[PDB]
Coordinates of C-alpha atoms and ligand atoms in Angstrom, one line a residue:
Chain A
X1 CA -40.6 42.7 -26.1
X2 CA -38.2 41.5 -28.3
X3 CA -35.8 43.2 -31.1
X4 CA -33.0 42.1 -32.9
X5 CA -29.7 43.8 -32.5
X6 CA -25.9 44.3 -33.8
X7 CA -22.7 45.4 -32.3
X8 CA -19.6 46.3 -34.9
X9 CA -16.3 46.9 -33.8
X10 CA -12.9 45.9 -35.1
X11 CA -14.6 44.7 -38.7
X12 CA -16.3 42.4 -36.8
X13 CA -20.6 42.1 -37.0
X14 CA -21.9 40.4 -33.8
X15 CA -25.7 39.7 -33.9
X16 CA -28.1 39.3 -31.0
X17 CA -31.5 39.5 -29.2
X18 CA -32.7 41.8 -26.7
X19 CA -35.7 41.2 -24.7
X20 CA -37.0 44.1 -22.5
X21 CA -40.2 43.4 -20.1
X22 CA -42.9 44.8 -21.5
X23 CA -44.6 45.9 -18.5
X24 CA -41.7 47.9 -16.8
X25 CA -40.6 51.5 -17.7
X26 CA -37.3 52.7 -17.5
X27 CA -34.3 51.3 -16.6
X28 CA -34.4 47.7 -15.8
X29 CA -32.2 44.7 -14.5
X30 CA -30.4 43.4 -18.1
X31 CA -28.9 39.6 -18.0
X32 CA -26.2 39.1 -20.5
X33 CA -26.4 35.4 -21.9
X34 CA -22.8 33.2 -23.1
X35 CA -23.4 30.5 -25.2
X36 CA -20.9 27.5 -25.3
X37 CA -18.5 25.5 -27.5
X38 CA -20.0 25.0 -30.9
X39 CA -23.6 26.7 -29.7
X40 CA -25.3 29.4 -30.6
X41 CA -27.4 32.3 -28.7
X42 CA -30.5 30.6 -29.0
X43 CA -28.5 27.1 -27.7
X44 CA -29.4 23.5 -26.8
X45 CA -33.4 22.9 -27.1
X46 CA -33.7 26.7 -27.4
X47 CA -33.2 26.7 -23.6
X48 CA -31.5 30.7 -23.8
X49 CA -34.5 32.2 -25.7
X50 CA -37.4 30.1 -22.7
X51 CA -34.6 31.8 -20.4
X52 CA -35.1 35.2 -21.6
X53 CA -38.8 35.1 -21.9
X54 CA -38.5 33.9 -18.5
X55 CA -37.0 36.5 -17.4
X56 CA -39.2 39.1 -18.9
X57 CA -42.1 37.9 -16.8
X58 CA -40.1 39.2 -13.6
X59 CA -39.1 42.3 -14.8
X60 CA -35.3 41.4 -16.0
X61 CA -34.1 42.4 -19.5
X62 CA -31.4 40.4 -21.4
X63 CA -29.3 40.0 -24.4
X64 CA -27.9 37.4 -26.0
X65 CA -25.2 37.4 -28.8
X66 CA -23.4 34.7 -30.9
X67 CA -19.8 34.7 -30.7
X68 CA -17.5 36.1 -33.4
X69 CA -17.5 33.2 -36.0
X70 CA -20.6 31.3 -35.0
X71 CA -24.4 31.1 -35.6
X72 CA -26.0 34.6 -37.0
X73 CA -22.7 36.6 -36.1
X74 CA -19.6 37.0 -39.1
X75 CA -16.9 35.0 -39.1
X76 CA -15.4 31.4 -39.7
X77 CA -15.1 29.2 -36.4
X78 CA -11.8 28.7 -37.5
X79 CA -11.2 32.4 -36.4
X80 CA -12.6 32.1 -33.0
X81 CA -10.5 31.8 -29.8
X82 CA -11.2 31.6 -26.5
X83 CA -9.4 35.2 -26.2
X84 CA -11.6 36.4 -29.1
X85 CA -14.5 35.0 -27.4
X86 CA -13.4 37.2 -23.9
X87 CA -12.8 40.6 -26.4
X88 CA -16.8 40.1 -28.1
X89 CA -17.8 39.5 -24.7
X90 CA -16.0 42.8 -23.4
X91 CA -18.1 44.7 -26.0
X92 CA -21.5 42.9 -25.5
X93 CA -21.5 44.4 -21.8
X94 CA -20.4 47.7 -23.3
X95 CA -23.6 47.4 -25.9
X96 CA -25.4 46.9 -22.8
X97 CA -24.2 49.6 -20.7
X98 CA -25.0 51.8 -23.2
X99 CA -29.0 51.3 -23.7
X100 CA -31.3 53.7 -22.1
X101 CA -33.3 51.0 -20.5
X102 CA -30.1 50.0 -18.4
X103 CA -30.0 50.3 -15.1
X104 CA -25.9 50.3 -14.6
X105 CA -26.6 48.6 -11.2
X106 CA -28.3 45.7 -11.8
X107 CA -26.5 44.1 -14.5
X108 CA -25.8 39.9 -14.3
X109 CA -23.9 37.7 -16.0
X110 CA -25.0 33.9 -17.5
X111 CA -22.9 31.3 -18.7
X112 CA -23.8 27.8 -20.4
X113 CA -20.6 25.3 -20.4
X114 CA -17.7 27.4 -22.4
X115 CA -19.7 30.0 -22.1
X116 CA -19.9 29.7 -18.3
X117 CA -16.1 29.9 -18.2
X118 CA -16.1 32.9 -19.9
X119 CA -19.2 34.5 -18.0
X120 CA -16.7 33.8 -14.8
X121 CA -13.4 35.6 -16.0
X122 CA -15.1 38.6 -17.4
X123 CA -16.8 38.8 -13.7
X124 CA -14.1 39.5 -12.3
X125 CA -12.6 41.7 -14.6
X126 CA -15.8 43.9 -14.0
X127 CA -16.2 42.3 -10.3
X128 CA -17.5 46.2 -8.8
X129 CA -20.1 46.5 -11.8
X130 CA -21.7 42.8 -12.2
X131 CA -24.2 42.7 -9.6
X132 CA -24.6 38.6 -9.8
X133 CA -23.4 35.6 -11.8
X134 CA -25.0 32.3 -13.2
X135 CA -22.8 29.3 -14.5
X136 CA -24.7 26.8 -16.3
X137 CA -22.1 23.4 -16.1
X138 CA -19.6 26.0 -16.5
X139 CA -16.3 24.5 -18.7
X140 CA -13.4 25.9 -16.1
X141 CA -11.5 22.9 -16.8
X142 CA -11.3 23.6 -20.4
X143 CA -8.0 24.3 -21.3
X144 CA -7.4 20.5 -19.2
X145 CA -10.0 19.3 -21.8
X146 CA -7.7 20.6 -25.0
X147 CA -4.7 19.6 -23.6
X148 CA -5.4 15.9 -22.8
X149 CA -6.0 15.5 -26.9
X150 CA -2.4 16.4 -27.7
X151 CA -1.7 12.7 -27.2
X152 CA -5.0 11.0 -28.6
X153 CA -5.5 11.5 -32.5
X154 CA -7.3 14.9 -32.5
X155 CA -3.9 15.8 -31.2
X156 CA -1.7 13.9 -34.4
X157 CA -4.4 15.5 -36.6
X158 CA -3.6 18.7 -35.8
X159 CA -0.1 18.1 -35.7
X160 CA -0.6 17.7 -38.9
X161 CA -3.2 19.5 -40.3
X162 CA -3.2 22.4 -38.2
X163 CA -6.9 22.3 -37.4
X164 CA -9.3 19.5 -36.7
X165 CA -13.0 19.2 -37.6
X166 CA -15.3 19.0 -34.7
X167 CA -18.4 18.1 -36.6
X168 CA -18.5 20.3 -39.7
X169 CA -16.6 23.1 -37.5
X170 CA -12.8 23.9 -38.1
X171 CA -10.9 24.3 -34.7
X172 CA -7.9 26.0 -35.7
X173 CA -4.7 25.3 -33.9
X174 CA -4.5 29.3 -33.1
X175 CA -7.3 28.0 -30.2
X176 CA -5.4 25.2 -28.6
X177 CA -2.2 27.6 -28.0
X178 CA -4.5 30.4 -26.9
X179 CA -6.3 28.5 -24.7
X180 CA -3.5 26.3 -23.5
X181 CA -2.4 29.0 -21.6
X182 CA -5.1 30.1 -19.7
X183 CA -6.6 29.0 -15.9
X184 CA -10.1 29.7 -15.7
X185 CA -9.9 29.1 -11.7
X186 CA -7.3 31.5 -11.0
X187 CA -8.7 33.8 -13.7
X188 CA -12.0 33.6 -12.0
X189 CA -11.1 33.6 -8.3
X190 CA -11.9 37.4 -6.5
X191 CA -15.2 37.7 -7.8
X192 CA -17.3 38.8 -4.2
X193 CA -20.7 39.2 -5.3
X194 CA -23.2 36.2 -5.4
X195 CA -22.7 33.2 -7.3
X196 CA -25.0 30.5 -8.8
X197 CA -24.0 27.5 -10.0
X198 CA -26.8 25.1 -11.7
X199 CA -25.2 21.3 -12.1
X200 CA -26.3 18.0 -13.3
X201 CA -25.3 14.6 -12.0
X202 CA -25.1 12.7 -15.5
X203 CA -22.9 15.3 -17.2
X204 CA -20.9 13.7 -19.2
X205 CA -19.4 16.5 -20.8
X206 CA -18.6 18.7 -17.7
X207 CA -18.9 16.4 -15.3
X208 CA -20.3 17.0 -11.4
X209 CA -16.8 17.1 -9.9
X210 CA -15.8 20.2 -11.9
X211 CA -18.3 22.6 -10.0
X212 CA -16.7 21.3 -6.9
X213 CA -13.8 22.6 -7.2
X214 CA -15.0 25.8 -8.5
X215 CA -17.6 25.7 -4.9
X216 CA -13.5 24.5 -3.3
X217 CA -10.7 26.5 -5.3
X218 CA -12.9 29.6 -7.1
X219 CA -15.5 31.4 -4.5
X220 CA -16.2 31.6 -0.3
X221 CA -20.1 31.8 1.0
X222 CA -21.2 34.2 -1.5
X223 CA -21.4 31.0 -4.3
X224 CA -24.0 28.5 -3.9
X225 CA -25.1 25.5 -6.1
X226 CA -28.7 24.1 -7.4
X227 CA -27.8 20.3 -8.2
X228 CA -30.3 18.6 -11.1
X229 CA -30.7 15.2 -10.2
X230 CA -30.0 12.8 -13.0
X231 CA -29.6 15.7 -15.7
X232 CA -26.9 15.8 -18.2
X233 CA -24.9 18.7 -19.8
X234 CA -27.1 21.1 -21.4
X235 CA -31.0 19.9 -19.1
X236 CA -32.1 18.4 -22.0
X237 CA -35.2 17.3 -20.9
X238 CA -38.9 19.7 -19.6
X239 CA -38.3 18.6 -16.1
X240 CA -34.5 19.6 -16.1
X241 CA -34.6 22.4 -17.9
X242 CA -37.6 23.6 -15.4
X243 CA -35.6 23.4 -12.2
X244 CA -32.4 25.3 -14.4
X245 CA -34.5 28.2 -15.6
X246 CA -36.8 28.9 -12.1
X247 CA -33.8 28.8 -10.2
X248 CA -31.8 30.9 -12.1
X249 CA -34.8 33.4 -12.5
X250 CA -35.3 33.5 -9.0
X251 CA -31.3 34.4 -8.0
X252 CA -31.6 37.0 -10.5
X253 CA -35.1 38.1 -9.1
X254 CA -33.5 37.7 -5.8
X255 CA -30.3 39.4 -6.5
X256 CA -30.9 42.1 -8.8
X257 CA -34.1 43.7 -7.9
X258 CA -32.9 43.8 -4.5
X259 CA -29.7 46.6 -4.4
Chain B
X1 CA -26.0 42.0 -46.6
X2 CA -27.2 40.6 -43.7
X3 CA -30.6 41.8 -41.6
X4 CA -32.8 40.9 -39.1
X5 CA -36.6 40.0 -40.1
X6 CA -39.6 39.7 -39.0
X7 CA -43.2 38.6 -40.1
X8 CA -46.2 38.8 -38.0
X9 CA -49.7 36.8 -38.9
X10 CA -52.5 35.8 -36.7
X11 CA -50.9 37.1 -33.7
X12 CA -47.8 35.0 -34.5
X13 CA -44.3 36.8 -34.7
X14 CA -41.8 34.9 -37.0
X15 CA -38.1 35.8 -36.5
X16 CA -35.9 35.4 -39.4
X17 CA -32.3 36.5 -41.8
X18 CA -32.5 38.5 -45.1
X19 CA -29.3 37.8 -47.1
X20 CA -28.8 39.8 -50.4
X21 CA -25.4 40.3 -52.3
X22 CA -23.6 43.6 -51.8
X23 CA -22.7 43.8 -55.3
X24 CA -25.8 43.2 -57.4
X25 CA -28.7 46.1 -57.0
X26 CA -32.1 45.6 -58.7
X27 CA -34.1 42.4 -58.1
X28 CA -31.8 39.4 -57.7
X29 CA -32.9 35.4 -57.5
X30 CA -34.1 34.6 -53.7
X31 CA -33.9 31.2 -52.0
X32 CA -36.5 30.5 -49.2
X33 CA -34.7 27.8 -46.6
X34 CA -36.6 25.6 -44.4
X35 CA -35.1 24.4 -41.5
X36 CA -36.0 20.6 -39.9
X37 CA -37.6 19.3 -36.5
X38 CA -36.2 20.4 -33.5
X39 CA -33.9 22.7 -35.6
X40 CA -33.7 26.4 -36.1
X41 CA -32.8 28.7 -38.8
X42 CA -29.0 28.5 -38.4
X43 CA -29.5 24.7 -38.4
X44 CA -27.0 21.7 -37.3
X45 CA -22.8 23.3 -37.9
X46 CA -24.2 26.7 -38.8
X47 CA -24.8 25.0 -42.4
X48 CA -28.0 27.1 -43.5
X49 CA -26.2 30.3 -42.3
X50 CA -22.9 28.9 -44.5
X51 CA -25.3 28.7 -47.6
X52 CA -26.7 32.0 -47.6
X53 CA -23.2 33.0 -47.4
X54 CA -22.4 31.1 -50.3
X55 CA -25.4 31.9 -52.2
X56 CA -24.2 35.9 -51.9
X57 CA -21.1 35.6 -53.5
X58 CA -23.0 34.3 -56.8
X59 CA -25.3 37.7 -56.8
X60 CA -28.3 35.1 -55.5
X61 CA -29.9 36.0 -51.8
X62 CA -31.8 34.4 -49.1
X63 CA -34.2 33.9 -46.2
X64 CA -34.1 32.0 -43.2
X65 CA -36.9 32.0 -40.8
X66 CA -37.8 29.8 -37.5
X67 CA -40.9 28.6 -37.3
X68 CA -43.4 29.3 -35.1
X69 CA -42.7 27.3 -31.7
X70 CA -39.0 27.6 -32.6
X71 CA -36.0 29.3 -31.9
X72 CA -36.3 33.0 -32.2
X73 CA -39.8 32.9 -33.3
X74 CA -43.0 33.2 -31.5
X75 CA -44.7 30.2 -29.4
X76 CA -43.8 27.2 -28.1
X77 CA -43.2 24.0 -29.7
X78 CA -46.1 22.5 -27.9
X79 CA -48.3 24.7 -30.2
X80 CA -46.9 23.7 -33.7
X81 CA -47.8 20.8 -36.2
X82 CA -46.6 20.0 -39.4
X83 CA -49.7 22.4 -40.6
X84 CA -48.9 25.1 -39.2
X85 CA -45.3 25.0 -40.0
X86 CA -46.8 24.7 -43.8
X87 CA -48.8 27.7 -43.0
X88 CA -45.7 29.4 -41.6
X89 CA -43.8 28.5 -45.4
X90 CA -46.9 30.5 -47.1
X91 CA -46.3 33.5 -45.0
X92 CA -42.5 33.2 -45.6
X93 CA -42.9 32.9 -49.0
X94 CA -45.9 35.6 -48.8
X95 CA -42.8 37.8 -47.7
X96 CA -40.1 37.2 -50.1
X97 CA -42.6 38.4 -52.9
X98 CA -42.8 41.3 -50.9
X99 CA -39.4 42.7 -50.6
X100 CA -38.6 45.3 -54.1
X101 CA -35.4 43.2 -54.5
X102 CA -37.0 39.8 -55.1
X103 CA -36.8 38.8 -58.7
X104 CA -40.4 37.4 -58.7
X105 CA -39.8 34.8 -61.2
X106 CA -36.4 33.8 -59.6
X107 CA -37.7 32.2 -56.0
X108 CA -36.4 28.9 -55.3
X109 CA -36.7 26.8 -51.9
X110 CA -34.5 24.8 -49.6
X111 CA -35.1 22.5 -47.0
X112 CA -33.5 19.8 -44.7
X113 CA -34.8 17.1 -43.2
X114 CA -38.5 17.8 -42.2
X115 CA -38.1 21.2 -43.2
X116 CA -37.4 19.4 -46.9
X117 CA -40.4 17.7 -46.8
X118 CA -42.0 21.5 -46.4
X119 CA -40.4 22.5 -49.8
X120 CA -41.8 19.3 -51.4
X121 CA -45.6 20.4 -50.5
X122 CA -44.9 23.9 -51.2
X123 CA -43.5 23.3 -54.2
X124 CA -46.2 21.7 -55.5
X125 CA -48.8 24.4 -54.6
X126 CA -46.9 27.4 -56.0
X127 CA -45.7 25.1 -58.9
X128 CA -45.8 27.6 -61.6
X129 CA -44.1 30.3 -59.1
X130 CA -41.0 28.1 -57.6
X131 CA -38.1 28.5 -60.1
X132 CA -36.5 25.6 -58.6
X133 CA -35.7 23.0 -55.6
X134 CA -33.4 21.7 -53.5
X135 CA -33.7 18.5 -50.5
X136 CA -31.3 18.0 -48.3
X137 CA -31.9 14.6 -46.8
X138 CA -35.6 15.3 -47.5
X139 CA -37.6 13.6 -44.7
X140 CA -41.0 12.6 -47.2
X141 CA -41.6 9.4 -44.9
X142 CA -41.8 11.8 -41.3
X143 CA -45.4 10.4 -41.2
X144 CA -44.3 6.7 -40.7
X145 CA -41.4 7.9 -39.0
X146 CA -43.4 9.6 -35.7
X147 CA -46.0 6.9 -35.7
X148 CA -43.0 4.0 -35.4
X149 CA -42.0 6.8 -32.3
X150 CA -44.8 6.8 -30.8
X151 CA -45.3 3.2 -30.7
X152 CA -41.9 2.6 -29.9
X153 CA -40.5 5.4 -27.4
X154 CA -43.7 7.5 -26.3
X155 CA -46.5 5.5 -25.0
X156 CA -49.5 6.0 -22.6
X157 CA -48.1 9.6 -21.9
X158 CA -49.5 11.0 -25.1
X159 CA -52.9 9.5 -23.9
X160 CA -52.7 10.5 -20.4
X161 CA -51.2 13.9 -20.3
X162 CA -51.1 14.4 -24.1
X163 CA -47.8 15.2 -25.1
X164 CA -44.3 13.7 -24.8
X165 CA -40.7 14.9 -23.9
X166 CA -38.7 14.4 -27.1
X167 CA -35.5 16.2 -25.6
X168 CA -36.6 19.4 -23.6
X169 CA -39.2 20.2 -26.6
X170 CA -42.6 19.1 -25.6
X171 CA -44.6 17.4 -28.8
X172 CA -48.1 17.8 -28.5
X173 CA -50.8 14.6 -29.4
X174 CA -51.8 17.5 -31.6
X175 CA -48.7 17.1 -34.1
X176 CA -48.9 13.2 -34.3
X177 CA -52.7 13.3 -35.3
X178 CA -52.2 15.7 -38.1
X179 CA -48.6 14.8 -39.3
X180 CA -50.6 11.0 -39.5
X181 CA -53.2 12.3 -42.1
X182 CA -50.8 13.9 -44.6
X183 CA -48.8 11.8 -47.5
X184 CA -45.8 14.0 -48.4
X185 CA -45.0 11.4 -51.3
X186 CA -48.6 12.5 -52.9
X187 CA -48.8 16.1 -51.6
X188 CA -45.5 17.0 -52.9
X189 CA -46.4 15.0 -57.1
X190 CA -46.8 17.1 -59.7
X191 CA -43.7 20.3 -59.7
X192 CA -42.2 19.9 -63.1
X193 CA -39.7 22.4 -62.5
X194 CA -35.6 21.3 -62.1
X195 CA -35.1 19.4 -58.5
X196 CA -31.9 18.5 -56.3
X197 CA -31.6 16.1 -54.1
X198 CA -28.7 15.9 -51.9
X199 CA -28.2 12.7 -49.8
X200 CA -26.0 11.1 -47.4
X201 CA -24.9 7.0 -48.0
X202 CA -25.2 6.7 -43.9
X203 CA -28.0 8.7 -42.9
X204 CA -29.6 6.9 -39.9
X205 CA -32.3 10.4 -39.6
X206 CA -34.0 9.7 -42.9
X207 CA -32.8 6.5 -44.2
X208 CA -30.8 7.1 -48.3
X209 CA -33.9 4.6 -49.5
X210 CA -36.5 7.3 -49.1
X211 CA -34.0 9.3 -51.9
X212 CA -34.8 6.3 -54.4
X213 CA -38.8 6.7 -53.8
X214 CA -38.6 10.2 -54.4
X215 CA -37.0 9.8 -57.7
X216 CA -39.4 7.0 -58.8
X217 CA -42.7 7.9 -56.9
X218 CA -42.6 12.0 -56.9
X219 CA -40.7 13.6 -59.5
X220 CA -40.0 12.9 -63.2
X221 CA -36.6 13.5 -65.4
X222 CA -36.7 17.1 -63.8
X223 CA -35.0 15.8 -60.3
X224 CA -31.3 15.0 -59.8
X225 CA -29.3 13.3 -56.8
X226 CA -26.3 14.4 -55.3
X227 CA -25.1 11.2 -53.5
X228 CA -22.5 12.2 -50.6
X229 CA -21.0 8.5 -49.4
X230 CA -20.6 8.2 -46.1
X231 CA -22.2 11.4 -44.9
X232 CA -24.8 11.6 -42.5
X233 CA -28.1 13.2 -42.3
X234 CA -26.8 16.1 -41.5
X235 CA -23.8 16.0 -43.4
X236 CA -21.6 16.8 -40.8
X237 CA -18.0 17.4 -41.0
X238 CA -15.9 19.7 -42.9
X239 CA -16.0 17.8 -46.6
X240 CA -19.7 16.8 -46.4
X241 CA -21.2 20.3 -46.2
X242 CA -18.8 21.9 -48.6
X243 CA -19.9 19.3 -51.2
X244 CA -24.0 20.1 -50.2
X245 CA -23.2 23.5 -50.3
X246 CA -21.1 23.6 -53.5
X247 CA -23.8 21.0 -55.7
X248 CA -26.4 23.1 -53.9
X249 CA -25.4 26.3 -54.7
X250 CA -23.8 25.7 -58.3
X251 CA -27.5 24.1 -59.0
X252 CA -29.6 27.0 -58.0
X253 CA -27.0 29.4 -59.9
X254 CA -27.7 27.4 -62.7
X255 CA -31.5 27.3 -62.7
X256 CA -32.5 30.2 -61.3
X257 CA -29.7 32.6 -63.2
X258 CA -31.3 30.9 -66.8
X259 CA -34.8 31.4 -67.9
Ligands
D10_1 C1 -15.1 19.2 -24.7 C2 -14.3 19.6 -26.0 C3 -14.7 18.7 -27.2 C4 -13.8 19.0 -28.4 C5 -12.3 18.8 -28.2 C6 -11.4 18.8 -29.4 C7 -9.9 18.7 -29.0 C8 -9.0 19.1 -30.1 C9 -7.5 19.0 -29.7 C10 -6.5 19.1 -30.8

């Protein structure tokens, strides 16, 4: 089953999809989906919405949400932090602990590149009430990312301008001092439950060395990686995207209908 | 206003936005968007989702649906063709004359790219009943444009295991048969009513040349060009889409608010 849904809070309209298995009565496992940096819930070759129906088929709910200021939800982009990003995401879990088809136990967290950075510090802010995480080429080193631009000309355009465009999208310069001052590694570190992280070799945008050091610096035995051989960022091809989706399905099959 | 839709036809479920001005009661002008290949309804930088927005604030509303085999819709995309993406436009259509705040006489439809060359066709067979139309980038030469792909990129696969991988979307043989029998040029001739065309000087998608046939093959002194120099397809940055919007949007206020 599928249904649209909303979330208000603070003037703010977030707008999602909720998939429930249609088999299963009662309360069920839900996985809560983060899009990335410039994406959108249904993201890159519609690879969240084959993840949810995925999902369905084992008897996992999930909801996914676009960020205040992209895609379906209100906003300008040019009002989005990484912060505001982390408070939207703080009242998507709360919008799912609420349904009467939650079970309160079996609730996971996915994250796709930015997304994936957030997905990581709200698990540990909830670490005793997330049952398992996903990062999908997760962004940790994205405040490292902003910060190298200061000195290349994104960084004398917004000295100037106060915001850049990214490709018909208006990064404010409220983002760049917001997230300059966050570490996604330290922020992320404590989080004791199990850990999958899905990484391809040709990323070019988060590259392989990144989920190294989250594997070195972030999590002990309970983390474990699925490399894609030869994929880049987002899995965009059948084959890549495959292997992402079945081996994320099965560590949430694996690790939340077992508890 | 913004809600959540949903049309169901032959066992197909398509997903879609309602957008109507919070202002304005009774039955207000309605533009029908169509979205391009491999896009959704929010399509590339959030522009569609920016032009209902737009389109609001002048008392005129909207719908954006994905069609079947993309994003929140029904199916995969190894299941459409062009033809049933024109059968999708129908039902769409089907459903704005529907809904007691559609001003039956004020519909007007949008498209980009592909999606564009879906308004051309529908135009023309609901000529009397389209107040007006707007291409963006209007992709009329998408037959010639998959059958250079397949000679090109695609190859024995089609013929062997009958589809290809065009990014992590898998196009079935069933899409470049029937796209190869259908003239959007000649399907498209004959809708006397006004027509925009917005197109970028750059466009390497659908190349500014296929602008000038449309003017001198399709339509009469009816159709007008917006030229954007530099843009591309997409028109993607900051200055690009505000000028598509703005001509877009000024242009349907215009014809669809007289009459
Ligand atoms: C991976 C991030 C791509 C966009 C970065 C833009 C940097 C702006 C700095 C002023």
């Amino acid at each position: 089953m599928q249904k649209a849904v909303e979330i208000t809070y603070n003037g703010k309209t977030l707008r999602g999809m909720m998939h429930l298995p249609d088999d299963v009565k009662g309360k069920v496992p839900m996985v809560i989906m983060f899009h990335g940096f410039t994406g959108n819930k249904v993201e890159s070759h519609f690879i969240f919405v084959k993840m949810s129906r995925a999902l369905e088929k084992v008897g996992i709910g999930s909801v996914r949400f676009d960020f205040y200021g992209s895609g379906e939800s209100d906003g300008d982009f040019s009002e989005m932090t990484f912060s505001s990003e982390l408070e939207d995401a703080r009242q998507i879990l709360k919008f799912v602990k609420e349904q009467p088809t939650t079970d309160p136990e079996r609730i996971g967290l996915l994250g796709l590149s930015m997304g994936g950075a957030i997905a990581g510090i709200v698990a540990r802010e909830y670490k005793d009430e997330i049952k398992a995480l996903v990062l999908w080429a997760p962004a940790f080193n994205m405040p490292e990312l902003i910060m190298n631009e200061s000195v290349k000309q994104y960084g004398a355009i917004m000295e100037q301008l106060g915001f850049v465009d990214i490709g018909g999208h208006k990064l404010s310069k409220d983002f760049v001092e917001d997230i300059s001052k966050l570490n996604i590694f330290e922020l992320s570190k404590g989080y004791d439950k199990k850990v999958l992280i899905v990484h391809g070799t040709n990323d070019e945008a988060v590259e392989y060395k990144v989920s190294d050091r989250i594997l070195k610096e972030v999590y002990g035995d309970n983390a474990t990686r699925v490399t894609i051989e030869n994929a880049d960022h987002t899995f965009k091809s059948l084959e890549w995207e495959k292997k992402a989706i079945e081996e994320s399905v099965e560590f949430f099959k694996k690790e939340l209908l077992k508890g």
